Amino acid sequence: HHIRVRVQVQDHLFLIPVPHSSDTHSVAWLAEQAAQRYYQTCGLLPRLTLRKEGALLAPQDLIPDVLQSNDEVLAEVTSWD
Amino acid sequence: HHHIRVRVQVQDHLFLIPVPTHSVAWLAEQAAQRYYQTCGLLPRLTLRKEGALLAPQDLIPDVLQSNDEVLAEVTSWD
Numbered sequence: 001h002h003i004r005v006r007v008q009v010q011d012h013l014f015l016i017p018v019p020h021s022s023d024t025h026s027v028a029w030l031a032e033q034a035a036q037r038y039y040q041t042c043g044l045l046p047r048l049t050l051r052k053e054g055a056l057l058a059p060q061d062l063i064p065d066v067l068q069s070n071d072e073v074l075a076e077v078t079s080w081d
Numbered sequence: 082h083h084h085i086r087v088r089v090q091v092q093d094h095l096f097l098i099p100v101p102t103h104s105v106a107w108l109a110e111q112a113a114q115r116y117y118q119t120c121g122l123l124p125r126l127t128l129r130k131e132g133a134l135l136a137p138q139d140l141i142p143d144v145l146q147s148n149d150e151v152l153a154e155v156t157s158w159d
């Protein structure tokens with residue numbers, strides 16, 4: 001009398017280059033870049049919350065202070081713009 | 082090279098679909114409509130049982146038992 005259906009959207013893992021700017025880029029910047037890549041790939045523009053190994057990253061923090069090259073962050077889609 | 086890997090993740094949803102003979106395609110349509118109601122997006126869905134694709138034209142009792150779980154993968158958005 002019922003079937004359980006798990007609706008799944010596959011993760012999209014993006015490789016985002018961080019340019020060689022003297023002004024270092026922020027976590028917020030990184031979220032924007034990932035959202036734009038998502039839009040380019042899927043036609044949807046997500047709002048994103050970034051975590052490193054389960055820990056929330058502050059948007060204002062600078063990428064090199066919190067991440068090493070080729071580290072992975074998880075970006076949760078919280079809504080669609 | 083300074084590269085960051087960003088894994089963008091969308092929340093899966095579990096729907097309970099009552100079956101009041103209905104096809105796999107019907108089941109996909111029910112799930113898609115629920116998704117649309119919940120999230121405002123209408124997905125195109127392929128259904129799998131334990132990783133194996135179910136043919137849309139197959140009848141639910143021929144491929145599934147009561148309370149079996151199927152994975153409905155979003156292949157695109159309408």
Ligand code: NA
Binds near residue numbers: 008093
């Ligand atoms: Na997911």
